[model samples]
Target chain A: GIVEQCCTSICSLYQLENYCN
Target chain B: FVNQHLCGSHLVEALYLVCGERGFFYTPKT
Candidate 1:
């Protein structure tokens, strides 16, 4: 569950790059 | 520096999950 949550969080953060720029 | 910190946090988080308390380690190849 930790891995899955971490991966989801990572992806969430990663996806923010588009709006961040 | 912000990018470095962000990426490093992600790397550590992933490594912790993948290693799963076995205390393994890794070195980045760049």
Candidate 2:
């Protein structure tokens, strides 16, 4: 489902959080 | 949910302020 899958580069999430905090 | 004024990694920074982990999922371009 579209709801179940999104941005494949989500690993960037870790990078996002790290720099944000 | 975003704008031209806010793009690229800066958007990520802005989203994190509002959504935290949830914000990370949004992809953007500058």
Candidate 3:
């Protein structure tokens, strides 16, 4: 995943749906 | 009143309570 405020690379199983969905 | 602002650019897309998505398209704020 990625950070919306900093444009940083983020990896977390927590936000998988928020993107893949 | 939509307007220009700042944000952390990303590929694919991103989600936020205030903003919408950040892909190749244009929409919402950061």
Candidate 4:
């Protein structure tokens, strides 16, 4: 079993966070 | 990551801050 999902998006002076597990 | 400026629409990814705008654009979800 391999289930992982992550998403991060910010539009206001550069900002991106990503995480998957 | 995004800084400034706009791309086309929706506002999902777009940046233009002295070149290092940092507007990553790549979406092909699978």
Candidate 5:
């Protein structure tokens, strides 16, 4: 099964903040 | 084309879907 783009977008949002902090 | 981008909670949701379908080992290319 493919991971939905929507989920990927949400996940990236969190990951970006995590990386910065 | 497979979706290769995912992280954290999104990854968790993917896990849930796979498990719900009774599968395992969903390794994202990204």
Candidate 6:
């Protein structure tokens, strides 16, 4: 769970989907 | 306007509400 910005992980949990989606 | 300026930075209270998920913080072990 690397928080590069909060949801920049390797696509696992859906804690919070950002605009990058 | 969606431009280069859109990319910004700030101090985290661990993590804030403005910036998105971009891990550039504390060590994973410390």
- Best DockQ among the predictions, by candidate number: 4
The residue-by-residue lDDT of candidate 1 on B1-30, one tens digit each, is 021222546756645554554543434444
Per-residue lDDT of B1-30 in model 6, one digit per residue for the tens?
Answer: 111111123223322333345533322222
Model 5, residue pairs in steric clash: none
Query: For residues A1-21, could you state the per-residue lDDT of candidate 4 as single tens digits?
Result: 001111232234323221111
Model 6: CA > 4 A from native? A5-21, B1-11, B15-25, B28-30
User: B1-30 in candidate 3: lDDT tens per residue?
Assistant: 232222444333333323344323333345
DockQ sort, best first: 4, 6, 3, 5, 2, 1
lDDT of 5 by residue, B2-28 (tens): 433565466656555535545444444
Task: TM-score winner between 1 and 6, please give it.
Answer: 1
The top-ranked prediction according to lDDT is: 5
Each candidate's DockQ score against the native complex?
Answer: 0.06, 0.06, 0.08, 0.15, 0.06, 0.08
Candidate 2, position A1, lDDT: 16
Q: Tens digits of per-residue lDDT for model 3 on A1-21?
A: 134422333443234324432
Tens-digit lDDT track of model 1 for A1-21: 222343444334342222221
**Interface RMS for model 5:** 12.2
Please give the range of 10 consecutive residues that has the lowest summed lDDT in model 4 chain B: B10-19
lDDT of 2 by residue, B1-30 (tens): 322233455555554675565434553432
Better of 1 and 6 by DockQ: 6
Please give the fraction of native interface contacts (Cα pairs under 8 Å between A and B) kept by each candidate.
0.00, 0.00, 0.08, 0.13, 0.03, 0.00
For each prediction, how big is the interface RMSD? 12.7, 10.3, 12.4, 10.1, 12.2, 10.5
Deviating ranges (above 4 Å) for candidate 1: A1-21, B1-6, B26-30
Cα displacement (angstroms), candidate 2, residue B26, comes to: 1.7
TM-score of every prediction relative to native: 0.34, 0.34, 0.20, 0.18, 0.34, 0.15
